[PDB]
């Protein structure tokens, strides 16, 4: 008789968890209205850690109820899934319970939902019946935000100026707008997300609503390009706080924009990370069936703490923590995990890569290159176990594969090179302003995306900006000092000297001058002091997921 009870107990867990998820998300407006940015940061951490409380709760419940079989439950759980609106995430929720019950072991198709096994409008149309002048007024008025506007007419004057430049005044009269019912919240931004329906086709329509210091809300820009929306919903950016009573309907809707993003990636963006992970595995399994390929060591410079592999044509890397680090890296395994935990909770500002913890990941022996098998068996022996035709990697991370900045820089000339170094400096500045210190600024630790943007991925040496002592390099006391191999001055742990950054960042004759004209501040300790002073004063630096030039103010 427990068969049905357990299945019902699990589904009760899902109904519970998703309701709370909605509530924590519902407070995104009030946090934004009151400019409570520390609670905005705090809510991201809570939503991320919400799913796991309920999985744990359900497991303990099941244990107390239970202190062939699983197929009885599986089918029971399967039977109440028709006429249940969010069956997809419920299946993932089911999976999470089995995975904890069986410590991520014997995961195959019929024992759990490794495969899918299977109202209220979320937008409303707006037509320029009385000109776009009034149309945009009605949209802005329909917003629930309880703050004032300085010059709504300024912003409405701006958005038309954009729309006129983007397409013809004949297309604009025949084009209309379908904006979503909710606001997508991130950091100090409230996003309006809509669709632009033109005779020539359907286009993204994005208006970020920002907040003047203790004041009004202004629309900072208007974005209508396919590629621009990618950036906004980027893998490197924090997840959106969006109220989605039916997410599967929203994922389908968002898909018309963001045409390049996969189901999983689209689920990630709205904040269903655990279900995204379920779809990430299916996207993995589908790719794997579609090709004859071997897992190889990822291109670029080898890791001194992480061992990372990939498939030749695959868009993601697998990173695993070695048993032993290089002799000069005085770190505990626990600390690297702690660094990875840190970035996952943290606001990434489109400058840090998102990871997915996987436990007991399964690979086929025939799929591994002999070079990698020996590397895995030699540098990560403790992490792997043997299962006949397959191996089990205890613990690894999966992230978006980019092209390592160290590699990219060798393939790039004048103009593009100028774009590369600009992206690096801005990356470093943005991260530093977001309370993050990038340990190994070395190029080999940054990736270059499809959009040409720079993202950090080595978390060996990460730490909070508030944790470090930025120092000037003392002027020589005597001539002798200029030629010494060692400092005459004492150096503490946590002491950083921006001056020395030059030797690793300006070796090459091309890149040096560019740093010297674009990012001179990176090598002065005073710049990092000013930044850290503001983080200590509680200030949060605004990030724009778009070019600074695109802004209305310029």
């Amino acid at each position: 008789g427990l068969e049905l009870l357990i299945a019902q107990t699990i589904l009760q867990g899902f109904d519970a968890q998703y309701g709370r998820f909605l509530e924590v998300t519902s407070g995104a407006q009030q946090r934004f209205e009151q400019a409570d940015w520390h609670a905005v940061q705090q809510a991201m951490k809570n939503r991320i850690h919400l799913y796991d409380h309920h999985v744990g709760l359900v497991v303990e419940q099941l244990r107390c109820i239970t202190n062939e079989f699983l197929l009885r439950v599986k089918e029971h759980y399967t039977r109440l899934l028709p006429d249940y609106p969010r069956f997809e995430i419920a299946e993932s929720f089911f999976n999470s319970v089995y995975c904890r019950l069986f410590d991520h072991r014997s995961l195959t198709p019929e024992r759990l939902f490794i495969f899918s096994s299977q109202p209220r409008p979320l937008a409303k149309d707006f037509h320029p019946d009385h000109g776009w002048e009034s149309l945009l007024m009605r949209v802005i008025s329909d917003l629930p935000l309880r703050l004032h506007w300085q010059n709504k007419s300024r912003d409405i004057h701006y958005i038309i100026r954009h729309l006129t430049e983007t397409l013809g005044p004949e297309n604009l009269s025949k084009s209309h707008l379908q904006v979503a019912n909710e606001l997508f919240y991130r950091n100090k931004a409230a996003w309006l997300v809509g669709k632009l329906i033109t005779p020539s086709g359907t286009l993204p329509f994005l208006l970020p609503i920002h907040q003047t210091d203790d004041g009004e809300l202004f629309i900072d820009t208007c974005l209508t390009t396919t590629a621009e929306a990618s950036i906004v919903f980027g893998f490197a950016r924090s997840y959106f706080m969006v109220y989605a009573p039916l997410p599967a309907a929203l994922v389908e809707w968002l898909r018309e924009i963001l045409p390049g993003k996969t189901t999983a990636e689209l689920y990630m963006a709205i904040g269903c990370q655990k279900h995204a992970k379920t779809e990430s595995y299916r996207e993995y399994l589908v790719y794997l069936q579609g090709c004859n390929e071997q897992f190889i060591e990822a291109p670029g410079i080898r890791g001194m703490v992480m061992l990372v592999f990939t498939l030749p044509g695959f868009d993601r890397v697998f990173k695993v923590i070695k048993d032993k680090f290089a002799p000069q890296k005085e770190m505990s395994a626990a600390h690297v995990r702690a660094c990875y935990q840190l970035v996952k909770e943290h606001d990434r500002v489109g400058r840090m890569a998102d990871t997915q913890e996987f436990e007991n990941f399964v690979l086929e022996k025939r799929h591994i290159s002999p070079a990698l098998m020996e590397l895995l068996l030699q540098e990560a022996a403790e992490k792997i176990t043997d299962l006949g035709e397959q191996i089990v990697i205890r613990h690894l991370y999966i992230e978006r594969r980019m092209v390592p900045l160290n590699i990219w820089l060798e393939q790039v000339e004048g103009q593009q090179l100028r774009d590369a170094i600009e992206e690096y400096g801005n990356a470093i500045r943005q991260l530093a302003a977001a309370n993050i210190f990038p340990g190994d600024m070395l190029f080999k630790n940054f990736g270059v995306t499809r959009h040409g943007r720079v993202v950090f991925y080595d978390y060996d040496e990460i730490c909070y900006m508030t944790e470090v002592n930025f120092r000037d390099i003392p002027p020589p006391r005597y001539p002798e000092d200029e030629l010494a191999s060692e400092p005459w001055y004492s150096v503490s742990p946590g002491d950083v000297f921006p001056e020395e950054f030059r030797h690793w960042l300006c070796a090459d004759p091309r890149i040096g001058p560019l740093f010297e004209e674009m990012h001179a501040d990176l090598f002065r300790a005073d710049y990092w002091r000013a930044l850290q002073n503001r983080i200590r004063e509680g200030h949060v630096e605004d990030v724009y997921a778009y070019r600074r030039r695109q802004r209305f103010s310029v």
Partner: protein
């Protein structure tokens, strides 16, 4: 792949039976080095070649093969390749090599390339020969009486770095074990207490003393002096003395002098006696100021060797021109011992003394003692004449200011 061209007409130095077969046509690898390495390396090559041509009539020649590490390695191999795996392999294979300065890191987070090479190539001996050069500015009255060779152990001692922070549990856990499990009664303050471990072993000790005694044999030195703090640390420093004395007995057949520990070891090549003695560390540091002539070759532990070498270099006015080498089971790496002085790099201004003198270490290590002498004669010749680079010129009186390359020529003109 590889971008090092192996010279066509050169030949590989071979190690067989624990002895170095040095061909008359040897391939020597050399790293240019970061910063001022660009000024000092050319100068060395010119002088080291000149010494060989003059000393051996042309019957010998060195086939130089540039290998890479550091900023330049970035310029040939790719963007963040600062130490290619082949560099280590080429150094292991060719047995003997020379490098300019590599950038040492301020700040704890980053990776040092110099230390990478050491631990990677397993070079456990730090060799530091100190002597005066006639005319060098000095703070002591008689620096001419100083001609020592310091064999410094580099893989053990407190320098190993086995330590725990105060109040770290690990420390408290360690302290706990000593206090109740081991019964240690001698830690005055067990709370808020950092801990470091000092390991000294027979295997680790004897590599060093063995190397030093051989060097004394190979180069006609008078004595080997084991320096230690035996009178306080009886099982670390004291065992280092005891093992060193035991080695000279068992392996080199040392006879006792007047029942005292001191041994008379006979040089197999010459017949001349090599005295094996020992002195306390704190005393030795006085004894080097007062009576340097007594001492010759010195073998000691990590911490002690570092202290003594830094003091000896001051006495002889050669802090800025100190030679160095790191030796292992299968290869040897001679280095310039100063920094990269990026401020001056490329102005052909700095003093190439250090690298040049590590080249003389190298030449002597190849058994080409004759050629090494001509550098020595060149260095003391050009110093006496006061034709020197800025670092000395400003200090001496009636001196001629020369550029790096020019001072090299001066060294050559006095050979």
């Amino acid at each position: 792949e590889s971008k090092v061209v192996v010279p066509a007409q050169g030949k590989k130095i071979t190690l067989q039976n624990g002895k170095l077969n040095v061909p008359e046509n040897p391939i020597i690898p050399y790293i240019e080095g970061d910063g001022i390495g660009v000024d000092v390396t050319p100068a060395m090559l010119k002088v080291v070649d000149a010494a060989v041509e003059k000393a051996y009539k042309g019957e010998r020649k060195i086939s130089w093969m540039e290998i890479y590490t550091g900023e330049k390695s970035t310029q040939v191999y790719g963007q963040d390749v600062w130490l290619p795996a082949e560099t280590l392999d080429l150094i292991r294979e060719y047995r003997v090599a020379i490098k300019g300065p590599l950038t040492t890191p301020v700040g704890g987070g980053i990776r040092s390339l110099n230390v990478a090479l050491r631990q990677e190539l397993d070079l456990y001996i730090c060799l530091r020969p100190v002597r005066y050069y006639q005319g060098t500015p000095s703070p002591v009255k008689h620096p001419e009486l100083t001609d020592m060779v310091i064999f410094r152990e580099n893989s053990e001692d407190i320098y190993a770095g086995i330590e725990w922070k105060a109040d770290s549990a690990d420390a408290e856990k360690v302290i706990k074990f000593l206090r109740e499990e081991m019964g240690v009664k001698k830690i005055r303050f067990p709370e808020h207490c950092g801990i470091g471990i000092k390991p000294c072993s027979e295997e680790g000790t004897k590599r060093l003393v063995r190397a030093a005694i051989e060097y004394a044999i190979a180069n006609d030195r008078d004595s080997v002096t084991l320096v230690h703090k035996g009178n306080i640390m009886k099982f670390t420093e004291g065992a280092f003395k005891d093992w060193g004395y035991q080695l000279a007995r068992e392996e080199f057949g040392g006879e006792l002098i007047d029942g005292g520990p001191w041994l008379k070891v006979k040089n197999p090549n010459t017949g001349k006696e090599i005295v094996i003695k020992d002195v306390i560390a704190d005393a030795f540091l006085q004894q080097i100021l007062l009576r340097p002539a007594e001492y010759d070759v010195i073998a000691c532990m990590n911490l002690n060797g570092d202290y003594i070498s830094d003091a000896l270099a001051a006495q002889v006015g050669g802090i800025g021109i100190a030679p160095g080498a790191n030796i292992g089971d299968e290869c040897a790496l001679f280095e310039a011992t100063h920094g990269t002085a990026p401020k001056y790099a490329g102005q052909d201004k700095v003093n190439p003394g250090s690298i040049i003198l590590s080249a003389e270490m190298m030449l002597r290590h190849m058994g080409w003692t004759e050629a090494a002498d001509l550098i020595v004669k060149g260095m003391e010749g050009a110093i006496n004449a006061k034709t020197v680079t800025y670092d000395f010129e400003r200090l001496m009186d009636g001196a001629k200011l020369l550029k790096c390359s020019e001072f090299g020529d001066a060294i050559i003109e006095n050979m």
